[PDB]
Amino acid sequence: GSKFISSSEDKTVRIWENQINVPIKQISDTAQHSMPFLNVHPSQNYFCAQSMDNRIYSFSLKPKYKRKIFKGHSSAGYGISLAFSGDGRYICSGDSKSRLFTWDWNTSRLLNNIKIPGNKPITQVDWHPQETSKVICSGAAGKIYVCD
Amino acid sequence: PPVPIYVKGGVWTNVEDQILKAAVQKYGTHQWSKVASLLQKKTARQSELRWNEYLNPKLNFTEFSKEEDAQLLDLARELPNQWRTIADMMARPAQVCVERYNRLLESLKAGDINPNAETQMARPDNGDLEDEEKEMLAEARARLLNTQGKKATRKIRERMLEESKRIAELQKRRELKQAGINVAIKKPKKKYGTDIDYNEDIVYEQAPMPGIYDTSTEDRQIKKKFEQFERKVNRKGL
Amino acid sequence: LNSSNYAELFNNDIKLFVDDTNVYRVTVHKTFEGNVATKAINGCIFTLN
RNA sequence: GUAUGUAUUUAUUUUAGAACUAGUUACUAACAUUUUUUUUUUAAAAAAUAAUUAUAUAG
């Protein structure tokens, strides 16, 4: 409830305190790419970002904010949400090819890869914190799919 | 935050010899200040001495043959204690010549400065490393890596940024296409009055100067194939 | 205004301390190149009686 | 500190992992202002001397 994050088209990330209008942290690299989605893991020691180079980088939520890599999906076109398990061991993402990808947060290994009806891609992927092993994906097709 | 080393003549270790070799491979023989900047606690002249006296592979470190050894006694007789001239006459380093002359005619404390340190044998190192030598090899790898200028590095950065900028520009168009509003792609602007757009015309079209044979049906077959490809990219999308 | 004058501040006549040390403050940040740059932030002119 | 470059669209063109922790190096930053002469012994002894500073730097 004190600080917050923003990402922008100019390939940088800034962190502000609540109303200071001074960025206390600039996450900027040379070979970085902009991220259309940010999220914070439930263990609160990390927040991760879905970058434009078809990967997911992850940074600390403690001070001296510093940068694992989640790869195996093509999401360069659209900008796609990501969710986490309600225990904090699983991360789940969507794709431009109508399939979702679930990695294990503890080791960064791609566990499964489940396709979805509808030719159109899938962007918003959200997890149910109470009932475990339950995801919902949806996209430009229009229907709302309840994946296991 | 390092206190200043004003006198930099020391004992050549293994680390500094190896960084001098992998610096001479890249930087070359005649730039010595740029070599000696890479390894601290030594001087540009002492780097030059360590190359020309010891680390050079052209130098002759073997045992003396019998003709060589008699040649040494005779030359040391003719030219009294002119050891650079003698060592030039033997194609051997002068320190080797002096020590072997002492071995013929025969048959350092602590807290002293050794002047002959560049011509003497190296010291192998303790097993792990020292901390300053870890720092030295880190900055030495960092300086032996780079082969670019300022302009070229900025070009790498600008190409990556223009690439990601195009990706965002297509992302918003695909979102508005899903919404049902078709924003056409804007073109880059011309920096001068006759700057050329390359989809309007074949820009300097040269016709292939026809010959004796006839190309009507092959023209029609190509035109069919290209029109069908453009329609397929329009519907299905490549 | 030395330490031997020190009580001159507590006369009846009105007077003010002005101070500028926090007027121009900046924050250092990394650029896209190697060098860093400074951006100004809010300041205060400290005047009290 | 310049040079120089880059950014700023509305008036609608028809359909192997998890956690904890602190300092050492480089580089950069028009961003920021605790006396003089000695002597002597192994902390103490001697001798000595005098109404208060710049907003100015660029290829």
Side-chain angles (χ1 to χ4, degrees), chain A residues 43 45-46 106-107:
Chain A
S43 74
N45 289 111
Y46 290 100
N106 200 358
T107 318

Side-chain angles (χ1 to χ4, degrees), chain B:
Chain B
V3 284
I5 307 165
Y6 295 113
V7 185
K8 292 184 183 70
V11 167
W12 280 94
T13 180
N14 193 9
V15 160
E16 290 177 352
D17 285 335
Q18 296 297 317
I19 296 170
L20 189 142
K21 287 177 75 172
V24 168
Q25 297 182 4
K26 173 174 174 69
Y27 286 119
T29 302
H30 289 281
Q31 306 180 2
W32 288 118
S33 60
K34 193 176 278 188
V35 167
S37 71
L38 191 59
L39 57 99
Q40 55 95 33
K41 290 189 285 187
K42 293 296 186 292
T43 320
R45 180 64 67 194
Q46 295 178 355
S47 294
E48 185 176 1
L49 268 306
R50 189 67 180 177
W51 182 259
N52 282 313
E53 293 292 324
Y54 182 68
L55 265 307
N56 194 4
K58 303 294 288 183
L59 291 174
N60 191 3
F61 290 97
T62 55
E63 295 293 326
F64 289 14
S65 297
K66 299 182 264 74
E67 293 85 1
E68 297 288 322
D69 216 4
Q71 184 180 1
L72 175 57
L73 278 176
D74 190 73
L75 282 177
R77 190 256 187 188
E78 312 312 330
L79 302 175
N81 65 46
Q82 307 169 13
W83 293 103
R84 295 286 184 178
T85 302
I86 288 171
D88 196 2
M89 289 306 300
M90 295 180 189
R92 294 185 183 270
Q95 194 60 251
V96 183
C97 174
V98 170
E99 289 179 354
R100 183 61 176 166
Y101 173 74
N102 285 320
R103 290 296 300 159
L104 288 177
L105 256 289
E106 180 65 30
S107 176
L108 285 173
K109 296 176 176 63
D112 292 335
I113 299 170
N114 193 0
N116 301 118
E118 294 89 7
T119 65
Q120 207 177 11
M121 192 177 177
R123 177 183 182 272
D125 287 327
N126 50 1
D128 300 334
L129 271 174
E130 195 181 358
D131 282 327
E132 290 86 3
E133 297 178 352
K134 300 287 282 185
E135 300 173 358
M136 179 186 285
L137 267 77
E139 74 182 6
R141 293 181 182 94
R143 198 184 299 173
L144 294 177
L145 191 274
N146 51 1
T147 60
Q148 294 301 326
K150 296 173 78 174
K151 303 285 281 298
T153 305
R154 185 180 295 117
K155 286 301 292 185
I156 288 172
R157 186 177 298 117
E158 288 177 357
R159 291 192 183 100
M160 297 187 74
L161 194 140
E162 181 66 30
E163 202 270 331
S164 67
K165 193 181 294 296
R166 290 186 295 112
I167 297 171
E169 187 177 2
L170 287 176
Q171 176 182 1
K172 289 185 282 185
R173 182 190 186 268
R174 290 177 181 174
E175 296 294 328
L176 284 174
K177 182 186 284 185
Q178 289 295 320
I181 294 96
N182 46 5
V183 173
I185 297 289
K186 66 179 292 297
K187 294 178 258 71
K189 62 177 288 187
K190 51 178 70 175
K191 301 180 179 69
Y192 51 101
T194 57
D195 199 354
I196 290 173
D197 192 3
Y198 289 101
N199 287 332
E200 297 294 332
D201 292 324
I202 308 169
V203 283
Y204 298 108
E205 182 184 3
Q206 194 65 249
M209 67 173 190
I212 51 174
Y213 301 105
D214 179 73
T215 58
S216 68
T217 177
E218 301 173 357
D219 193 2
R220 186 173 64 245
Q221 198 274 126
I222 281 178
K223 191 170 183 178
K224 188 77 180 297
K225 189 183 291 183
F226 171 72
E227 188 174 2
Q228 188 167 356
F229 171 73
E230 291 283 323
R231 290 173 190 265
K232 186 260 291 180
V233 174
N234 194 5
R235 270 75 173 269
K236 184 177 181 291
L238 190 137

Side-chain angles (χ1 to χ4, degrees), chain A residues 11-60 63 65-119:
Chain A
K11 55 180 278 186
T12 185
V13 179
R14 270 75 179 267
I15 294 170
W16 286 270
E17 294 177 351
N18 197 11
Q19 296 177 357
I20 299 295
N21 204 173
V22 178
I24 60 169
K25 177 65 181 180
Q26 176 176 355
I27 302 166
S28 69
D29 296 333
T30 295
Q32 199 181 3
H33 294 283
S34 62
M35 46 286 293
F37 190 77
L38 298 165
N39 196 1
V40 54
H41 189 72
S43 74
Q44 293 175 354
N45 289 111
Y46 290 100
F47 72 97
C48 82
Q50 178 162 351
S51 180
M52 196 65 78
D53 52 358
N54 296 319
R55 292 174 183 175
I56 291 174
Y57 291 151
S58 61
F59 306 101
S60 294
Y65 300 89
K66 197 181 262 78
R67 185 176 63 84
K68 294 296 289 292
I69 295 97
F70 297 105
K71 76 280 189 186
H73 68 285
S74 177
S75 295
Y78 299 100
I80 283 96
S81 295
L82 60 90
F84 292 99
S85 66
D87 180 72
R89 192 187 288 270
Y90 297 94
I91 181 174
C92 60
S93 299
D95 198 77
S96 66
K97 283 94 172 67
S98 298
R99 71 265 179 95
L100 80 154
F101 292 88
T102 296
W103 295 267
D104 185 74
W105 176 259
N106 200 358
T107 318
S108 71
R109 183 179 177 88
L110 193 143
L111 295 175
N112 57 2
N113 188 4
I114 301 170
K115 293 183 181 293
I116 291 98
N119 287 318

Side-chain angles (χ1 to χ4, degrees), chain C residues 2-48:
Chain C
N2 52 19
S3 67
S4 64
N5 288 323
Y6 170 68
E8 290 292 332
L9 305 175
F10 303 102
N11 291 320
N12 291 122
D13 57 350
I14 178 166
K15 65 185 74 176
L16 283 81
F17 285 114
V18 300
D19 189 76
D20 61 333
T21 55
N22 301 320
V23 169
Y24 179 63
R25 293 180 298 164
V26 295
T27 56
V28 177
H29 72 286
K30 187 77 177 296
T31 56
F32 283 165
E33 303 187 1
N35 44 0
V36 298
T38 63
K39 189 169 176 66
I41 56 174
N42 291 104
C44 66
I45 300 169
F46 190 81
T47 67
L48 83 160

